[PDB]
Ligand binder design. Structure first.
Ligand code: HEM
Length: 378
């Protein structure tokens, strides 16, 4: 019956569409008509979203689910583990999870510090005003994925717009990574891609995984760096707390993840009848889920609509949950824990360079949410 509430409020860039809260607080699982007319369900409560995301009976194949944000489904491509179901998905997870632990990703902390440092240096040389996305929020996570995969230093510039060029397609990236995989097979190094050349993945699977990673590790991270910097610079009291207690970086990253919920909406399809929140979701029905509503659920978080880095903690669903929990979440944490405090240590008076209403927001249906540019000065 209901449609998905998607309209953001004009003075409130960080908060969810107003209609979600009253829906969630009344019926955290409810019937929903999708943009294409499919009648499925909408999960907005934190517990019900977790139950959807943890249950392997829920498919993420694009030829099984209906998309909740557009009125529009093909089988998954090699390497696109987010849209592959068990048991193939389980093969990717068993191979990759142990390579993506915090203990392994913390070994890239120095790389993250130096990537961050280099982009801060180029910002100061240019001077304000400038676009934080072009100078910092997009190149930092791009160079981080390049470091993770061991992309040659002299090739990395092909993967992001020049800081002041052809934007690579998926096919362009597959061609590049086919060559790089062959090179690492012949001459291994201490990096993830070299390590994976000894696995059972086919060339097509490994090349697809790399091309996916260059988007999966970049788009959301970039928009988190932009939105999180904007939110922090409006809260000088929280910046003071982070300056005085730099150990608060870890909590601040979790609280920003919860508050921003940039991967705001998704869906899954039932592979068989599933009891969910007192209802039977029948085989073939899609359940849309709202990460952003779940991350503001008062059933789960005190004062959910207040941003307070001092109480930041794991438990939010900003990296997903369960079957397809974000593989890169520990790397994302390492890079954001470096980046947010470093930006304000170098530019303590960082602030917007335009009226807040002039910041160009992404359209309400785009995922991830974020901004197209973030003009800043200092
Ligand atoms: C702050 C930055 C990031 C956010 C907000 C984010 C968010 C997410 C979310 C919400 C999902 C699950 C989507 C769903 O359930 O439909 C996911 C999956 C995934 N992410 Fe991330 N991610 C980020 C960074 C990264 C990075 C840095 C990498 C790689 C280096 C990465 C790789 C992946 C992969 C491979 C999956 C699929 C995992 C699976 O299917 O088992 N992510 N991410």
């Amino acid at each position: 019956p209901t449609g998905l509430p998607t309209a953001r409020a004009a003075g409130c860039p960080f908060d969810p569409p107003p209609g979600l809260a009253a829906l969630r607080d009344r019926a955290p699982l409810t019937r929903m008509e999708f943009p294409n007319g499919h009648v499925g369900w909408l999960a907005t409560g934190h517990a019900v979203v977790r139950a959807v995301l943890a249950d392997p009976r829920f498919s993420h194949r694009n030829d099984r689910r209906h998309w909740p944000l557009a009125d529009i489904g093909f089988p998954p491509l090699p390497g696109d583990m987010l849209h592959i179901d068990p048991p193939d998905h389980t093969r990717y997870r068993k191979l990759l999870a142990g390579k993506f632990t915090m203990r392994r990703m913390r070994r890239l902390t120095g790389s993250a510090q130096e990537i961050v440092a280099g982009k801060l240096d180029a910002m100061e040389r240019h001077g304000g005003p400038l676009d934080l996305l072009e100078f910092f929020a997009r190149p930092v996570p791009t160079l981080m994925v390049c470091a993770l995969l061991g992309v040659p230093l002299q090739d990395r510039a092909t993967f992001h717009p020049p800081v002041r060029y052809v934007e690579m397609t998926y096919a362009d990236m597959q061609e590049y990574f086919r060559k790089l995989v062959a090179a690492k097979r012949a001459a291994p190094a201490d990096d993830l891609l070299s390590d994976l050349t000894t696995s059972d993945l086919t060339e097509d699977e490994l090349v697809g995984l790399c091309a996916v990673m260059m988007h999966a590790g970049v788009d959301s991270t970039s928009n988190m760096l932009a939105l999180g910097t904007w939110a922090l610079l409006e809260r000088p009291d929280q910046l003071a707390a982070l300056r005085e207690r730099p150990d608060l970086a870890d909590r601040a990253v979790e609280e920003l993840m919860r508050y921003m919920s940039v991967v705001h909406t998704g869906s899954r399809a039932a592979l068989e009848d599933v009891e969910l929140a007192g209802e039977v979701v029948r085989a073939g029905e899609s359940v849309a889920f709202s990460v952003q509503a779940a991350n503001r659920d008062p059933a789960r978080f005190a004062d959910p609509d207040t941003l307070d880095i001092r109480r930041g903690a794991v438990g939010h669903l900003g990296f997903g949950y369960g079957v397809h929990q974000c593989l890169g979440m520990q790397l994302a944490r390492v890079e954001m824990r470096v980046a947010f405090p470093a930006l304000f240590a170098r530019f303590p008076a960082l602030r917007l360079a335009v009226p807040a209403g002039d910041v160009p927001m992404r359209d309400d249906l785009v995922i991830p949410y974020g901004v197209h540019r973030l003009p800043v000065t200092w």
